[PDB]
Design a protein around this ligand. Sequence first.
Ligand SMILES: Nc1ncnc2c1ncn2[C@@H]1O[C@H](COP(=O)(O)OP(=O)(O)O)[C@@H](O)[C@H]1O
Ligand SMILES: O=C(O)c1c[nH]c2cc(Cl)c(-c3ccc(C4(O)CCC4)cc3)cc12
Ligand SMILES: Nc1ncnc2c1ncn2[C@@H]1O[C@H](COP(=O)(O)O)[C@@H](O)[C@H]1O
Ligand SMILES: Nc1ncnc2c1ncn2[C@@H]1O[C@H](COP(=O)(O)O)[C@@H](O)[C@H]1O
Ligand SMILES: [Cl-]
Ligand SMILES: [Cl-]
Ligand SMILES: [Cl-]
Ligand SMILES: [Cl-]
Lengths: 160, 281, 363
Amino acid sequence: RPTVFRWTGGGKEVYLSGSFNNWSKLPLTRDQNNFVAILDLPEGEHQYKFFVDGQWTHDPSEPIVTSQLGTVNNIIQVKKTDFEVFDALMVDSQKAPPILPPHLLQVILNKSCDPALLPEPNHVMLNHLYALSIKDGVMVLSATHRYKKKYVTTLLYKPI
Amino acid sequence: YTTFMKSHRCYDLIPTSSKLVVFDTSLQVKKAFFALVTNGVRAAPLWDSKKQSFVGMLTITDFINILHRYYKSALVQIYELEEHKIETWREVYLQDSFKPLVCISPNASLFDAVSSLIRNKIHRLPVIDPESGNTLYILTHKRILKFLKLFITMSKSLEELQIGTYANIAMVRTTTPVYVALGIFVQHRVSALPVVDEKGRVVDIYSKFDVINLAAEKTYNNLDVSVTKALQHRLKCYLHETLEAIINRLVEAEVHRLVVVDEHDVVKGIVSLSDILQALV
Amino acid sequence: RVKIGHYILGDTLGVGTFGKVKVGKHELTGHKVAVKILNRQKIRSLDVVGKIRREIQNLKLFRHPHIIKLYQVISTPSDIFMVMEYVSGGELFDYICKNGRLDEKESRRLFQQILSGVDYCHRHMVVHRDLKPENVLLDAHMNAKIADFGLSNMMSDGEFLRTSCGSPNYAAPEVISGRLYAGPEVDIWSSGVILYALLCGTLPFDDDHVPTLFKKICDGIFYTPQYLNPSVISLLKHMLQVDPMKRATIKDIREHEWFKQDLPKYLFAKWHLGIRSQSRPNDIMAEVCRAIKQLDYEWKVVNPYYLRVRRKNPVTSTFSKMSLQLYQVDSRTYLLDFRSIDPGSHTIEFFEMCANLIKILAQ
Ligand SMILES: Nc1ncnc2c1ncn2[C@@H]1O[C@H](COP(=O)(O)OP(=O)(O)O)[C@@H](O)[C@H]1O
Ligand SMILES: O=C(O)c1c[nH]c2cc(Cl)c(-c3ccc(C4(O)CCC4)cc3)cc12
Ligand SMILES: Nc1ncnc2c1ncn2[C@@H]1O[C@H](COP(=O)(O)O)[C@@H](O)[C@H]1O
Ligand SMILES: Nc1ncnc2c1ncn2[C@@H]1O[C@H](COP(=O)(O)O)[C@@H](O)[C@H]1O
Ligand SMILES: [Cl-]
Ligand SMILES: [Cl-]
Ligand SMILES: [Cl-]
Ligand SMILES: [Cl-]
């Protein structure tokens, strides 16, 4: 159940007091303008304050709660969804025409051997519709598709 | 041996990258047979646009049927073949005598497919995925027989085991016209006809495959020609030969059938790819 | 002691694509790890929430000796931690700075290793764009390790990438020109410059004057010092092709006589696309909309050149989707492409869907 505590600001000495540690001055480690501490907390409500160089404060950017006695402490709701990566990433998520890539100009039908057998296409040209010029009032249509690790190029002879 | 088939899925036999030709039922039937030739394919499924499903399969048998059913003379056009849709002809051929589409899933076993070939007496079986509804590949006897031979790592005479048709064999002569010969494939429902000389000796063989040359060379309008004249554009076994060697002979030539011949090269019976796969089922 | 997992977080190693990277020494064992820190609030500020989800999904199942392994992802309410394998050696870039260029034999060894990794990614439909010796780290035994998958991307069937990401000296001409690309080709160009850097100790495409750098890159013109082996000069000339269609494939590199040398065991009837109307692109889009609505199809206008259309089947009563995109062939002509989007046959339903549109359209 790890929770990150970070103080973005400067200081000679910064501490973290919280409900979770019976309001004891736990010291934060400086890197740059960040003072951190990672600690395991039970999934519930926790209040905390900071002791930045002889002054008690809260992180104004973080959610607070004002007491009946006019005490302002930060609040943290450690939710179950915050623990599992894919559950957390889910909750978090809430001109001119392009130049034709030359890849689409490469087919497997044009370029002895078995007439049914064909070369393996590039992934990029799959599901694209190809057609042969309409001769004798009948349209020819083609496309390579994949079913599992095999490919099938279907030719449709449809009159128009 | 058969236990191998009941286990292996159809999918395994589908090649890495293949070509499938589909004709809409509304396509003119002559254009359809020429497309089978240009694309170099022996069978094509048929999509009924009005029904929004594959209602059937177009093969050489249909071409043999139209040809024999409608050929009037060498001097006159086969006006039907020339101007008829696949649907117009499908209605004539299958009036009250109706037959639906036979297909297999890629997840289904190789056995299920072999059993379904003999069950419905067909040589071309389409493979269709249930969810997608797409025709993936046309499963043939030759492809199954190939994969099985590549897997063999019985052993008695062809006369001992007794496999295939050996009684009343459908045959043609040197002089036999194509029309006459097509009429044999029609009433008998056989794939090839051995060509015999002046005596009982077999000189050649006219197959259903040799009928697509008529579509290819656009010569179908003259079926008065002898079967030998027709075969101008371009194998037997013995009753004392082992089954494993006969299976080996068929695949090391990629041919549908072998002729069981006598000492003086005279026909005595036949053994088809269909029959071998049946014995191993 | 700032702990995560059971490792004590230490000094910042560097700063990656989306966050700081720090050392981690295990409380008991002393085993060292590299920890990427992604602030949940900062990852949602840039719309990278999705990219990170993919980035993890991939790296979490990859396992190649020349790709930095991702051990575990630890989620906290504030930030996200990516625990990865640590390598003492640091950047390959710094190695080539302190020591000079590598001897043919040593360059080849490392290039075989990098390309192996690059292949493994591509074999998993992942394309790490931004492939530089700065992102190639080394271990105590001198093994290459590919590392910043922050600019990586998936390879989808029938889809191109657009993002012009990576350093300009390592970027492919199509990337700098901001054109569309498949994915593997842009990694090959980068692998080509990495090979140059390994053999020569300098960059092939480099200039203070940015326009003359970009000119050289798009003109695929570079210097080949006298000391360079003609066989590797042939490999570089093939890998640093300005035309992607003329560029070396991993298969073409694998087949090369320079690559193959001492290679270890452990690594490794004219058809037409769409229809081409020569009219005004703004007018073609208005024409296709006048055609799609005249067929009773529901759609969604994404780009002023990309459309996503759906059709209700009158028989199977199933919705079938397909996408339309208009590109530009000539300076004179433009073409409309039809892509399939995953009962009766899905493939045939697509063909019939497209056919109707074409029957009432130009070229
Ligand atoms: N799967 C199928 N479903 C329905 N009819 C079929 C199927 N396959 C073939 N047919 C029909 O069976 C008949 C004979 O075909 P077939 O023996 O397969 O030809 P060929 O010997 O050229 O392969 C034809 O009339 C054809 O329409
Ligand atoms: O920097 C950023 O943008 C950060 C965003 N979210 C963070 C979360 C944490 Cl925990 C830290 C962190 C971690 C360890 C240290 C230490 O170096 C070990 C002792 C001092 C210092 C800062 C940094 C960021
Ligand atoms: N020319 C033929 N005459 C008689 N029966 C045949 C002939 N060719 C094949 N058969 C038999 O017809 C059945 C189906 O054969 P096939 O159409 O060749 O797959 C099998 O039982 C074959 O033995
Ligand atoms: N028993 C056979 N001996 C020699 N050629 C054969 C035989 N059976 C079929 N063929 C040839 O095989 C082709 C037809 O193919 P298929 O119907 O698939 O066997 C034709 O060129 C025939 O001449
Ligand atoms: Cl850095
Ligand atoms: Cl240390
Ligand atoms: Cl190390
Ligand atoms: Cl360098």
